[PDB]
Amino acid sequence: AVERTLIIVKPDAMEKGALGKILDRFIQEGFQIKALKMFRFTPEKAGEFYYVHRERPFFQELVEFMSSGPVVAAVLEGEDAIKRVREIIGPTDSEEARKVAPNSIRAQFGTDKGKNAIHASDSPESAQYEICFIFSGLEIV
Amino acid sequence: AVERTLIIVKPDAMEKGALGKILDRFIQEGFQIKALKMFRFTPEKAGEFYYVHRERPFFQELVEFMSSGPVVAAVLEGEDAIKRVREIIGPTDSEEARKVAPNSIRAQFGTDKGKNAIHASDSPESAQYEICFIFSGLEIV
Amino acid sequence: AVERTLIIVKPDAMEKGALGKILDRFIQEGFQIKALKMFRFTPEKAGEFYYVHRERPFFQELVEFMSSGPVVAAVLEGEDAIKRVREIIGPTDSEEARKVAPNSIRAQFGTDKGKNAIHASDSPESAQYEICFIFSGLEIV
Amino acid sequence: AVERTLIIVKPDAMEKGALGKILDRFIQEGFQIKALKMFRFTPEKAGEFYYVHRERPFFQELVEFMSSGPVVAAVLEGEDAIKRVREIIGPTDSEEARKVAPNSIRAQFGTDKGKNAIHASDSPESAQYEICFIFSGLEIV
């Protein structure tokens, strides 16, 4: 069915000037952009956004990086969007993306496992949580 | 447990200059205001916000009224907030509120069944939906 | 003529539960609230908002305090609003406000010179800058 | 000197899927994107945004079109940004743009005089007004 998912273009991809190319990719893939904004996570908000990983070893690095500069979030809508967007961005490790998914966003714009260009919701539950964290219903148009 | 709920001060109460008194009441009742903003529903958004009532006879009147002027929404947090806030605002019919709940918000500031001063989420499920409709996680502070 | 000015309710007054009473005061004084929101200054933003005082000795304390917790900003509209609102809030030193302007907001809710409850634009030029810093034209309704 | 200007990607360019390519163009031209969001003008807001043209014959058509669907606004920052961005988008009539400025945004993505893909501030004064209309200082990051 038609679904909504969240992507966030990370500070590394922002700095590389990849924003337009990244959005264009999702447009060409046939998604509708339903919400879009540039903003900046505070460390606290980034921590809340990533609450599920608070126990993980990479947590602090992730929170700091994701609050180190402005990011751009978008709500993408389309058939099977959550699963399809995951596949489009590719594996978390940018280097591995270049090895196994050479057309993926992370292969094209990601540097490594931390500076990997982009985030996307990994499940229906996480999509619901993440979209609401960033955008209100008033912002979805 | 500690809960969050949504209130919206409606155009009638806004015009009456009741906004400060209404917020003060919830403050005195011991709630934390976690989010707050003045905005205006488009007819479309008001329709979406009230989707559950699309079948009801009052629907069009409600949507028009709720988009007829600016409103103010707040997220209220506190122990048992959802049920407590419902009780504080009182029955939907302002006139009946004056009869059976004379200290309720609707008794004090409501006019009738339509111009009844204020909205509050009526359940945990509707609270979750309504809060996200109006406020993002970024706006809850 | 009819003017617009900005107020911000500071963290001290927020913690005291004074928000509703403060807004009510301005409503009773005959002002229209044209915009309203709860948000939180980052230290960087608070610094920008107060750029004119960057040279002053109190600057760092002010910036830290104003980013120490959530605040609420409102746009107030009315005849001669800028000068009238200044007079309603009273002198910067809360203690002095109690001595020379006992009905002022700062006399009622302020503690001292730093925790002085509320901010208001001090001139037409600063009003224009401050309103735009906090609210877009899209948020003025 | 370094300046800020506003662009708005119009509903026609949005529908053509041109958003990514348009932003990428400005990135390649060496501008920083300081703010970005997808939103929708109400007819009233579009009218306010375009107040200078209220007397013009095209006014009503412009207001309706610009409120006919979601748009995307960005703040662009760079040396001589206001003048440079004007030149990049090209003449208002998309067809004339293809004739005299074949590399301009409007030549590439515009259809005619009304569906001409994109708006940009035409002067320092209008830039100041337009940026503030769409984005608060809190949204510029």
Side-chain angles (χ1 to χ4, degrees):
Chain A
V2 170
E3 301 169 355
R4 288 174 179 181
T5 190
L6 184 83
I7 60 163
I8 306 177
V9 182
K10 305 186 174 180
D12 58 322
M14 291 297 300
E15 288 167 16
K16 284 190 159 196
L19 176 63
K21 286 168 191 149
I22 292 172
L23 298 179
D24 181 54
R25 172 64 176 278
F26 288 113
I27 291 169
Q28 299 313 315
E29 292 285 358
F31 296 101
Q32 293 299 318
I33 301 179
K34 304 291 298 180
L36 184 71
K37 85 180 153 196
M38 172 170 297
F39 70 101
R40 181 161 177 163
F41 278 118
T42 61
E44 178 194 84
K45 290 292 179 186
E48 295 179 6
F49 180 86
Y50 290 110
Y51 77 97
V52 303
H53 298 139
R54 63 201 188 280
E55 310 294 7
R56 298 306 213 95
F58 54 83
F59 186 62
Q60 282 304 332
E61 169 180 338
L62 174 60
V63 164
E64 175 174 296
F65 174 60
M66 288 301 289
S67 55
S68 69
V71 294
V72 171
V75 172
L76 302 182
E77 184 180 277
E79 189 64 54
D80 219 14
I82 290 166
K83 155 181 142 64
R84 285 208 284 140
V85 164
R86 280 198 315 245
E87 304 169 2
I88 290 159
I89 75 168
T92 333
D93 181 339
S94 303
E95 206 59 68
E96 178 158 54
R98 273 180 290 281
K99 288 298 192 173
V100 310
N103 301 137
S104 75
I105 297 301
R106 284 165 167 162
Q108 291 164 6
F109 304 103
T111 300
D112 51 33
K113 194 183 168 189
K115 287 174 170 40
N116 63 0
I118 188 171
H119 164 92
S121 312
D122 99 311
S123 67
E125 323 79 60
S126 79
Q128 173 182 331
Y129 174 76
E130 291 177 3
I131 289 169
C132 288
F133 201 88
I134 303 306
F135 294 106
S136 74
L138 297 178
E139 297 175 88
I140 317 275
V141 298
Chain B
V2 176
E3 294 169 357
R4 286 172 186 181
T5 192
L6 185 80
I7 58 156
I8 305 176
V9 175
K10 305 186 170 180
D12 55 326
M14 294 288 288
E15 286 169 17
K16 283 184 174 248
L19 174 59
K21 290 164 187 158
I22 287 172
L23 295 180
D24 184 51
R25 169 66 172 277
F26 289 115
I27 291 173
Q28 303 303 318
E29 296 279 357
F31 296 102
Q32 292 281 297
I33 303 180
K34 304 297 298 183
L36 182 71
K37 84 180 156 196
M38 175 173 295
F39 70 100
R40 184 169 178 156
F41 277 119
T42 62
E44 178 198 81
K45 287 297 177 189
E48 289 175 22
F49 179 91
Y50 288 114
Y51 76 98
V52 305
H53 295 132
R54 64 198 182 279
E55 303 303 349
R56 301 297 181 94
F58 54 84
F59 184 71
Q60 306 292 354
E61 165 184 341
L62 172 65
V63 164
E64 177 176 274
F65 174 58
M66 288 299 291
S67 56
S68 65
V71 293
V72 170
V75 173
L76 300 183
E77 180 182 281
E79 180 69 37
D80 223 27
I82 295 169
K83 96 177 198 69
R84 286 210 286 141
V85 164
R86 280 195 319 242
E87 164 171 44
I88 289 159
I89 68 169
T92 313
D93 183 347
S94 303
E95 303 276 14
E96 184 171 41
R98 275 181 288 279
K99 286 297 183 172
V100 306
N103 299 135
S104 66
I105 300 291
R106 288 174 168 150
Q108 292 170 192
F109 300 109
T111 295
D112 52 35
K113 291 187 66 177
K115 290 172 172 33
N116 63 353
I118 190 169
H119 166 91
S121 312
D122 102 316
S123 67
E125 308 69 36
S126 78
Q128 181 180 332
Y129 175 75
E130 292 179 355
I131 288 169
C132 287
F133 200 92
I134 303 303
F135 295 107
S136 75
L138 295 176
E139 294 168 272
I140 320 270
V141 293
Chain C
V2 176
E3 295 168 355
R4 289 174 182 178
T5 196
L6 186 80
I7 57 159
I8 306 174
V9 177
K10 303 182 171 181
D12 58 326
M14 294 288 287
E15 286 168 17
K16 285 184 173 251
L19 173 61
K21 289 166 189 154
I22 287 171
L23 295 182
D24 183 55
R25 172 65 173 278
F26 288 115
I27 290 171
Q28 300 308 314
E29 295 281 358
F31 296 101
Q32 292 281 295
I33 305 182
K34 303 296 295 181
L36 182 72
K37 84 179 155 200
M38 176 172 294
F39 70 99
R40 185 173 177 152
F41 276 118
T42 66
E44 181 198 78
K45 287 301 180 183
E48 290 175 19
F49 178 90
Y50 287 114
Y51 75 97
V52 306
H53 295 132
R54 64 197 182 280
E55 303 301 349
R56 300 297 181 96
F58 54 84
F59 184 69
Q60 305 294 353
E61 166 186 337
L62 172 65
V63 163
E64 177 176 276
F65 173 60
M66 287 302 291
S67 58
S68 67
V71 295
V72 169
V75 170
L76 298 186
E77 179 181 285
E79 182 67 37
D80 226 28
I82 296 173
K83 92 179 202 67
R84 283 212 284 142
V85 163
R86 283 193 318 241
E87 167 184 29
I88 289 164
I89 71 169
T92 312
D93 182 346
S94 301
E95 260 295 90
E96 185 172 41
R98 276 181 287 281
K99 305 223 75 141
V100 309
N103 300 135
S104 68
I105 301 292
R106 288 174 169 153
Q108 294 173 194
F109 300 110
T111 295
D112 53 36
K113 288 155 78 176
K115 294 173 167 33
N116 65 353
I118 188 172
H119 166 89
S121 313
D122 102 315
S123 66
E125 307 70 35
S126 80
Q128 180 178 330
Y129 175 74
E130 291 177 0
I131 289 169
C132 286
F133 199 92
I134 304 304
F135 294 107
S136 72
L138 296 174
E139 295 168 272
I140 319 271
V141 293
Chain D
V2 174
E3 296 170 357
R4 291 174 175 182
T5 191
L6 184 85
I7 59 156
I8 307 181
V9 181
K10 305 187 178 182
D12 58 322
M14 292 296 299
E15 287 166 17
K16 285 190 161 197
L19 175 65
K21 289 169 189 143
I22 292 173
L23 298 175
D24 180 54
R25 171 62 175 279
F26 287 115
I27 291 169
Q28 300 315 315
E29 296 284 356
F31 297 99
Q32 293 300 314
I33 302 174
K34 304 292 300 183
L36 184 71
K37 87 179 153 200
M38 173 167 298
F39 70 100
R40 180 162 179 162
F41 280 118
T42 60
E44 176 194 85
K45 289 294 182 187
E48 294 180 8
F49 180 88
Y50 289 111
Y51 77 99
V52 302
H53 297 143
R54 63 201 186 281
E55 310 294 8
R56 297 305 213 96
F58 54 84
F59 186 62
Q60 282 304 333
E61 168 179 340
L62 174 63
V63 164
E64 174 173 297
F65 175 57
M66 287 302 290
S67 51
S68 66
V71 296
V72 173
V75 171
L76 299 184
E77 181 179 280
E79 189 63 49
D80 217 14
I82 292 170
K83 159 181 137 70
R84 284 210 282 145
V85 165
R86 278 197 317 246
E87 300 170 3
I88 289 157
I89 73 167
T92 335
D93 179 341
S94 303
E95 189 52 42
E96 177 158 55
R98 277 178 290 276
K99 291 297 192 174
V100 312
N103 302 133
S104 73
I105 296 305
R106 284 166 167 159
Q108 289 165 5
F109 304 103
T111 300
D112 50 33
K113 305 186 82 303
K115 287 174 171 38
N116 61 1
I118 187 172
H119 165 90
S121 312
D122 99 310
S123 71
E125 324 79 60
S126 78
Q128 176 183 327
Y129 174 75
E130 291 177 5
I131 288 165
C132 288
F133 199 88
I134 303 306
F135 296 103
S136 73
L138 297 176
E139 298 172 85
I140 318 273
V141 298

